[PDB]
Amino acid sequence: HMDAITQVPVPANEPVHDYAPKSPERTRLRTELASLADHPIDLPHVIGGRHRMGDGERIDVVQPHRHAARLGTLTNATHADAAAAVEAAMSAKSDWAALPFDERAAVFLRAADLLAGPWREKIAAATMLGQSKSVYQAEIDAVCELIDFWRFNVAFARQILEQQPISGPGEWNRIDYRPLDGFVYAITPFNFTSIAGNLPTAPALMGNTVIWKPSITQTLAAYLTMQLLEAAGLPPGVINLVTGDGFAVSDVALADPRLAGIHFTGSTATFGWQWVGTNIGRYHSYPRLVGETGGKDFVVAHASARPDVLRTALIRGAFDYQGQKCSAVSRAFIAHSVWQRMGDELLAKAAELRYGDITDLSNYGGALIDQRAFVKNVDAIERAKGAAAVTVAVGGEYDDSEGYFVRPTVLLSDDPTDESFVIEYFGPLLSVHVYPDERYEQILDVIDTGSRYALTGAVIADDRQAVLTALDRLRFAAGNFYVNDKPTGAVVGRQPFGGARGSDTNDKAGSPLNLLRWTSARSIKETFVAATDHIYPHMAV
Template identity: 60%
Template sequence: MDALFTVPTPENEPVKSYAPGTAERESLQKKLAELAGTQLELDMNISGEWRTGTGAEIKVVQPHKRAHVLGVAREATDSEVADAVAAAKAARRDWQRTPFADRAAVFLRAAELIAGPYRDTLNGATMLGQSKTAAQAEIDSACELIDFLRFNVGFAEGIYRMQPQSSRGVWNRMDHRPLDGFVLAITPFNFTAISGNLPTAPAIMGNTVVWKPSPTQQFAAHFLMRILLEAGLPPGVINMVTGYGEAVSNVALRDPDLAGIHFTGSTKTFQHLWKTVGDNITGYHAYPRIVGETGGKDFIIAHPSAQPQQLAVAMVRGAYEYQGQKCSALSRTYMPASLWRGGLKDIVLGMTEELTYGDVADFSNFGGAVIDDRAFAKHVALFDRIRSDDKATVLTGGSADDSEGYFVKPTLIEATDPTHELFTEEYFGPIHAVYVYDDGDFETVVKQASDIAPYALTGALFATDRRAIAWASEELRYAAGNYYINDKPTGAVVNQQPFGGSKGSGTNDKAGSWQNLVRWVSPRSIKENFVPPTDYRYPHQG
């Protein structure tokens, strides 16, 4: 076809409320009952074919009902990962030569399938498998994932339209080629949207992918893979393998054709991936691109001029939504004494104690359970440590119960030492520490808080004094990749607040913007001279 196509202009997907009496609430509740009533074989998908693995069984359960098995996955073996890598390589030539309009159509159709007939399925699977409430699932597995697919297609078109200047008699062009090999996408448990974005962003740019979801997100990942195939994704473009990843490290990370890694997860795992690439650097055909987001120790700093009620709501929502299991979740707050002792402490404490965690199918609950026994044990160990700590006082919470699910109570701790581990270590749970400072020490506190933690993902400042906002915003310039003024440090929206941080938080390649998509191309400059010279001599030689 002779045409320069323009993709549909993307817009952010509207968020449904699931309020009592709404049609979407009733529909989602029916789907939840249906999904909970079946047990699935959570197989791999290699070259478009579903395959039951041969490794050890992994039971995927509801974290809030840990005896309820949703499905069974299997640990991928070396040979199965090798098959996935081979499938990605085999599909690469045809996929990278597929016209952009045809590639884009696959992901635009997937977005429409999620927005329409599969919205309840993906939201319900995320709720049951990852213990998210309806509201948290809606903004994640529906809206954010739809936004990633639509906007990434738009970002890709924008990149392709970025062309160099040409002088008279010359036509300069830029060929935005896919990378030299396959991309490995390793995705986390906490966001279905991230699980969808990490393999599809490189694929939109013409790359083929080996995708390993987290076992604790495998239930929703299974349905997402089905949606991509129904949307027309050709065999081998995205190959999903299951399990904890030992075979991925053994095979995919060391393959000569590894061209890139797209990762979200723990700092320790990301460093292992990077080190493995470094140890094998002489064996690759090209230098692998490494893009990763690894976590944070996210903060609110309150100035004495902050509005108390707004600050309280931001603290409670920021710290305790999705049980604190967001990379951006609030875990440390710096509070002026005049506000804290002037009534704000009682407001925050009261809100926190009103929160209910339970079965996410009960829409009255604010949250669910933490993801698994390892997370649960980590939080219990912290509570044991601080129980006799004279520098930390548990104001509410500080307890956990795994008799039915992995429940950790929303915990508020007041600490007197701003260098305490409560202000430096990432816990990834509903644990929120507050340090109270003398009002006159605001600038000292800002400087200390800026550098005390090894991360730089998200942070927020609450103030109405414009001079304080201007000064602190400059002082905190490198403390957070996503910085909020008078808002909680969570809830980034695609194309509105591109997401990512630096230091120990990752490579800051900004998911939800063109800056991420451009990492998945290897540009080629082309110069065509319409009238080449015919004499080797230059004018100055005359």
Template identity: 50%
Template sequence: MTTLPLPANEIVRAYAPGSTERARLKAALTTMSGNRASLPSIIGGKAITTGNLETAVMPHLHAHVLADAHLAGAADVKAAIDAAKRAAHDWSQTGWEARARIFLKAADLVAGPWRYRLNAATMLGQSKTVHQAEIDSAAEFADFLRFNAHFMTRLYAEQPISAPREWNRVDYRPLEGFVYAVTPFNFTAIAANLPCAPAMMGVPVVWKPSPNAKLSAHYIMAVLQEAGLPDGVINLVYGDAEMVTRIVLDDSGLAGIHFTGSTGVFDHLRREIAAGSYRNMPRLVGETGGKNFTLAHASADVDALAIGVIRGGYEYQGQKCSATSRLYCPRSLWPTLRDRLVDEIAQIRVGDVRDFSCFMGAVIDRRAWSRHAEAIARARRDSSHTVLTQGEPDDCEGYFTPPTLIETQDQNSPLMREELFGPIITAFVYEDARFDEILGDIDQTSEYALTGAIFAQDSAVLEHAQAKLRYAAGNLYLNDKSTGAVVGQQPFGGARASGTNDKAGSLWNLTRWVSPRTIKENFIPPADWRYPSIEPDASI
């Protein structure tokens, strides 16, 4: 049997001053920001330009237009579905080796000649700093492709036992129909993985990217085409989300949805699917919201805790699904931790991500910025909340929300329950003796269960806390920040209102895109229909 090279995580480059990668990335940023691109939909392998344009801008300099996307109309969406259906027969019959070859080549293109273009598109279009872009659009994108190919072979190798004179086997058939991939703005790698995972398993895809990640979606598609992806296997459709989704959900050939986005939208999709009529029951795979916690015990290392809170809550402007947004700290540690956090936060540089000294860029758009500005203003008006940090939201040139730390006396405050998806952390200070009660409160305060972090030097406390919080997070970190899942190391996903927990970048996710068929072959069939038990007893 053919085997693949064992995957290894792509090395994250440092972009240190004077390095070759720093110079090449800066050159890519200059070129890309100086050229206004045209972004067609890609349907059946063809570039579709409609003339109905929507701009893509820099969130950190929103007057600067990077590109114009050609929005698909209803006829174009139907054409994308038809293209996927036409591709289905040949693609589903294509051997796994040929499918793997395409995506492994794409991984090498991502890690090599396309690296700086992908990083530049992610930085400019989604306002990621150089490090945040590198770990996403270069390293994680390549990791998803390489590890999924490996997981695919592991899945195919999972076969039943056979009795003598028989051969039992499982045919991991691609789902019958097409998958609808709905992808977010916050991770280029996730935007790539959601269409690529079902496609790797032999299922064609209609892909609707986020309107706030149009530029990077364009480059993802270009990489896949260069790698040799056949026409129609993945169809990239820019367009109105409601219109595109309505047409897709009305098609009886829909076999599944691969989704990352808000809980409300995913709930809507689930209800629509339940009311629809399909040839097969569509598979629903969704990663949605989070209200992720960091819990400190009195034995915690305050230095490690402070770093975990800052990185976990403020990297990429708190716009990671896994970002810390609620902090529980014992009163004995709070004065030291509070002062440390306030001092460190004051040193965080926020600005244009082309300035590599910035730790944070802008939030993604005006709607997000307004939501954050209102939450901070509401906290200032509420006597049970204290805003501990300086800085005010500013949208004059870019959508800048400062890293904000709020202390609340109300552990059931909306700031402790509701997802803001921004650089706002709300802290609740508990009495040290109430540690056990706080564990129960953390589990019940929010509807979400995506990630969480526990800081304690006492190993017995870690064991006790993780047992009590077993269902409070799909990814739990001990003495580490709540973010940063790495493909192949920490499969990612959560439950409750955070999604279906199908663990992106894992074998479990790939099982959702196949429909197993069990085959039994009998080499020597029986010669008589009678069983020995029905023979008469011997005469005495």
């Protein structure tokens, strides 16, 4: 055994490498890019530790920006694959939950260090290739954010474990953070390798076992993530990877009475789940549904905005990763006088911005993720051309012949930009409304009244009263709020929480609150000299 009260290593955010010319990481990245691109692989299910192709339909995983180039091939999970994944998860449970916390933690700390060192460029390259990220977008996601999730989750879990009660005289009260009963189903989106590795591993840390269904277009990085976790010592069957479109997996998982929870991130059309509220009397436990939605963000620039700050925040905010982060800047509200100072430069920089094959590191970004996404963006661009209220100021061109390429596009809207248009796609489309300087407060009212799907908002202003007025008036109109920068993805530990207006997602990844969803806390009270007569003092004569 062990007689100790141990402490975990203290986490700090992983440094972001630049991959500048002549840097050694750039050289290593080239090697991994060649190696994955030139040697495509089978992308098997991983069930009970066994890597195996199943009997379902073969589905190719390709490079979005060069969709003739295959990266691998997976098999669409069948009902039998899914049932096997569930059994394996249940069979691993007892040995996994019985491992002390510190041994469970070590797996994830070791994974973090493996990802920071020897697997770093490989996992980054895989994310570049399959999800069409530039090296910077890959690095902040697949490397830094996933490393951070693991190290910070370990520290968060350790902090949870030491939250203990008061013992009164004559007793000792303690709290045991039990894992859940039954397996956790994690369903992960294309957009982030970090979210994809975190959703299955966070519940696993707390002693649970898991079935993990990654998104098809992210499955190369997801398979490699599974390999990394195995190399870190994750025991067989603690997490079980099932590839494909997810339909047969949900049919099995949602019908199984042992379903203890769902950790999911993607649309709010898949947030609709209904299917669990139906079957409630079939489940041994009440399933825990722990989800994040996407959304579309706004920036408001007061007359005191710095123009080069605003311009850069718009370009990065809208066009980083081709507008495909969980949210992206879709609507800007810019004071007339500031638009005079930077409107031409915004349009010119957007016109010059290079999207292409992300193995050419000079490009700013890549292509859209797949054909469905390309079509939604074509449809939005064509709506904008046809719409009276909207002019295409720059961009708008698209060509799916080599990759799913859509050019950065800036729309000018004469009337405040209407949120419902902006939500039908994820893509590099920025809508700008120019408003008279003196109408700042009225525009804040319009944003507030007309924004239900903003995860984030920003105010660009040097004037402190303008800043505070935005923080006050838009307090409920977005979930995370930015001052003088692009509103974007959080860094772990730095910008937790948020969500769209009205959401209930304080328990999303990024704080201890997520890890508490994967535990069932119980109090233990021992009384040292309990009563030996039942009569109470008030009862006396």
